Design a protein around this ligand. Structure first.
Ligand SMILES: NC(=O)c1ccc[n+]([C@@H]2O[C@H](COP(=O)([O-])OP(=O)(O)OC[C@H]3O[C@@H](n4cnc5c(N)ncnc54)[C@H](O)[C@@H]3O)[C@@H](O)[C@H]2O)c1
Ligand SMILES: NC(=O)c1ccc[n+]([C@@H]2O[C@H](COP(=O)([O-])OP(=O)(O)OC[C@H]3O[C@@H](n4cnc5c(N)ncnc54)[C@H](O)[C@@H]3O)[C@@H](O)[C@H]2O)c1
Ligand SMILES: NC(=O)c1ccc[n+]([C@@H]2O[C@H](COP(=O)([O-])OP(=O)(O)OC[C@H]3O[C@@H](n4cnc5c(N)ncnc54)[C@H](O)[C@@H]3O)[C@@H](O)[C@H]2O)c1
Ligand SMILES: NC(=O)c1ccc[n+]([C@@H]2O[C@H](COP(=O)([O-])OP(=O)(O)OC[C@H]3O[C@@H](n4cnc5c(N)ncnc54)[C@H](O)[C@@H]3O)[C@@H](O)[C@H]2O)c1
Lengths: 245, 244, 244, 246
């Protein structure tokens, strides 16, 4: 397996990209600690060899620190947790702004701050953060606070990469286009005409399809593996040509 | 003047880049409304033709909304306010993280959401945001929360530019290298050996100097003027070759 | 004027962006040496205070070297010459590939290598190169060799900027979206349905217009001026939200 | 089952360095590899490896290229590897240096793509990987004028092909390394006045205190060549050990 010997911790693992990653990591021989707030859905992964699960709300610092004190070592941290708000800056009220900033960015700060010292004591570690093309990468309509947080993810990634490169740490982030996940389906259904919302989303995608969560996972495998040891400080795009032009 | 007939509001105007921008706008014929929390320093600008002042804390939504209700129209909003925390992710306590996120990003969100509707009703407007090369542009050491916020600023910029391009709104951000401002001097002094600190900052700068606030201001003039009408959604770098 | 005391040499000056640049530089007090292969059109600029003209084919090293020897000093070199080939990689025959590489890229290399030593001896110089968003910035349809060359331009820009920063040289390039020039009109007319071709080009442009050459010129004035001394190594976008 | 099972892959400059490592890596992942180079005796060493067939090919010769293409029934992937690294500023670069690099580093790719793309279009499926560098439009690097210009041009060419042929099932990406320990890198070190010291300037780029191996570059090429990366197109993928980071 491409990840033999690796201990990997991830968040938001119960469905979507996190689930697919958890499964993909485990199949490649990793020791996976898969976390989510949704305990009943999460515990489904316990049936898969190589995966152990734990309930974790990434907005709760007390929860995070206690979890960190339980973990002996890790090789990889994959911060997946994030919410996609629909709206422009005018559509974003204070509670939407804060909710996204807390879940999407503060979460990563708290996870990295709890887990990075373990990596530093072993002079080795790898941190993968979930960003988006809707970010500093490009402008995307109706995604104000999302794009703002997802840009923030890139800043945080490059910061960590620069600060700890000489202590054996790498840090990268993943920037997908549209991925067929349960939340995407929720966002389609939430529209006034879902039949039509599905077509706006496909418009971005000149190949005529969304990415699968598995495809996103296989990039995370590459970035988790020693194959990519020489890759750090990058937003890796996986967008089906959306940001291309 | 290159900014004649323009009504420009800007924050953090009492010193540094804000101050230089205020004075540069005014010299180019703008009607400037220059805001800061520091009332005594801010009110020095009152002596300059074209500048009117108002005390404003950009972290206070209530103050922001009241200010907006006072303003009949604008052409340009320049979000300048921001703090530079020194440290890695490990040096950043929750208080540091939240203070920076509130002043550096939330501020912009609240200012934009208050003033943008004005611009939309006139089908015209221009929002300039202060970012930095310490951001999504490149990795800079001991600047964790700062870089995170300044990246957020680029995301917010591109978002606003994308959402309101068809309603005559432009949005760009400015990404300096090291600029000789009073806060920069504070950061130098704050280190263990301020001699040595000054040389680390210069190491960034292969031209052997920092930028002046007036130089940053002249970029802001270009971006504020109709000369740059066709420029939107960009992080404009002004870094003396640092990110090169 | 904003360019008072600057000696500025430019290519492809007889029409389009070059022409607008020349007139804009002259209006701001520059001493302009405007060059082009089209002698009769070029000579029109002679009537404008501050512009002297010289015929120059930028694909002819021997002409370039002899021109350089005529020139005592410069402050700015503006490489404007470039041709826009229509087609994919499959539409591009060896003749199209080579013609574009030589005019669009080799030209810049020859002008730079002939004029840069002057700037090095003054310990001061500024090189502006015309790029495009159709380049390494973004992928654009039916622009294969063009995009290849305009990418090459960014490479060359950043090279020169990195190599000569400590000797007082700056180098940047300009990356437009669609600009309403005579060659753009020629490209429109050259299509099967020019009525419909005008609309494809417009679809690029969410503000519903092309840039004017004057607008591109004003970016060039900013980049040519000492106002922008701290700006080097950048591809400056001016695209009306196309790459956004 | 290898990650490249069923894939027919053609590459250039396969006899040493990145190209060699890639050929070997593609073959071990179950690709059918057609490995080409100008250096016949060295290239022929790869014939002992299961899955690799070799052919002499000078990528500056249009006539050679078209005849080779006429020999190939199908391909899934084209990896354009050939490129020379000139040492010097714009001032150090004479007409012959400029032209030599432009023809090998860029014209070569144009000709290979123009010969092979029609095959991929006819199958409504193809993947083109181009070798670029961080010394390019990505960042400014000293003493690399014509190299950086060509490797920028590669990125422009990559995005053009990706934009033009996306709807016909074609992907195009490029790879942008920092310093890779290859034989030509060793040549460039040895060619300096003090090779001990050239070696340390190259290491200065590299905050991790090492160069990449050709193998490491290869494994990125495996990912980009595989269907795992089917949703990746139009990108310069950086693999630079933090060099462009800051
Ligand atoms: N799906 C896409 O089109 C797409 C595109 C780009 C980026 N992303 C990013 O990928 C990541 C995952 O999204 P997805 O769509 O694959 O999954 P999703 O949105 O379908 O699932 C989210 C998961 O996160 C969990 N979660 C919610 N709040 C949490 C909290 N406080 N703590 C811990 N877990 C929590 C949920 O229980 C759920 O299992 C997000 O960061 C998202 O921004 C998604
Ligand atoms: N090297 C540099 O100085 C540099 C480089 C890149 C970007 N920047 C950015 O430029 C912007 C201005 O920084 P500067 O160093 O020119 O000025 P500075 O930091 O010296 O001045 C900051 C000003 O902001 C005001 N201020 C502080 N909190 C406020 C609040 N809550 N509400 C309203 N005003 C408040 C202060 O009273 C002061 O007048 C910042 O966003 C900074 O991040 C500076
Ligand atoms: N027009 C646009 O939409 C647009 C967009 C992006 C970039 N550009 C770039 O701007 C530059 C100028 O294009 P434009 O469209 O403004 O002008 P244009 O194409 O209308 O005019 C070109 C000028 O170049 C001159 N010229 C041609 N060959 C020459 C040679 N060998 N030596 C010297 N001069 C020569 C011509 O005589 C003419 O006066 C080009 O590099 C072009 O790629 C144009
Ligand atoms: N530090 C690095 O080594 C580094 C970094 C970034 C990018 N690259 C790129 O990787 C590619 C390979 O370089 P490398 O250093 O791994 O290998 P190399 O330079 O050691 O070997 C080059 C190979 O190309 C072959 N070759 C030369 N001319 C040819 C021609 N006309 N036709 C066909 N083959 C020809 C040679 O015989 C040799 O086998 C180049 O494009 C280079 O620019 C290398």
């Amino acid at each position: 397996g491409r990840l033999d010997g690796k201990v990997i911790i991830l968040t938001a693992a119960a469905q979507g990209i996190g689930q697919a990653a958890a499964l993909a990591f485990a199949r490649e021989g990793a020791k996976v600690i898969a976390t989510d707030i949704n305990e009943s859905k999460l515990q489904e992964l316990e049936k898969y060899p190589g995966i152990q699960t734990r309930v974790l709300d990434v907005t709760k610092k007390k929860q995070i620190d206690q979890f960190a004190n339980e973990v002996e070592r890790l090789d990889v941290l994959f911060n997946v947790a994030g919410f996609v708000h629909h709206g422009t800056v005018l559509d974003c009220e204070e509670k939407d702004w804060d909710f996204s900033m807390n879940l999407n960015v503060r979460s990563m700060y708290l996870m990295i701050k709890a887990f990075l010292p373990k990596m530093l004591a072993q002079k080795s570690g790898n941190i993968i953060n979930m960003s988006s093309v809707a970010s500093s990468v490009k402008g995307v309509v109706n995604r104000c606070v999302y794009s703002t947080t997802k840009a923030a993810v890139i800043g945080l990634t490059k910061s960590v990469a620069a600060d700890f490169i000489q202590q054996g740490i790498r840090c990268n982030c993943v920037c997908p286009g549209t991925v067929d996940t349960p939340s995407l389906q929720e966002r389609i259904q939430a529209r006034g005409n879902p039949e039509e919302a599905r077509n706006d989303f496909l418009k971005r995608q000149k190949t005529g399809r969304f990415a699968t969560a598995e495809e996103i996972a296989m990039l995370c495998v590459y970035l988790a593996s020693d194959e990519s040891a020489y890759v750090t400080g990058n937003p890796v795009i996986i967008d089906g040509g959306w940001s291309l032009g």
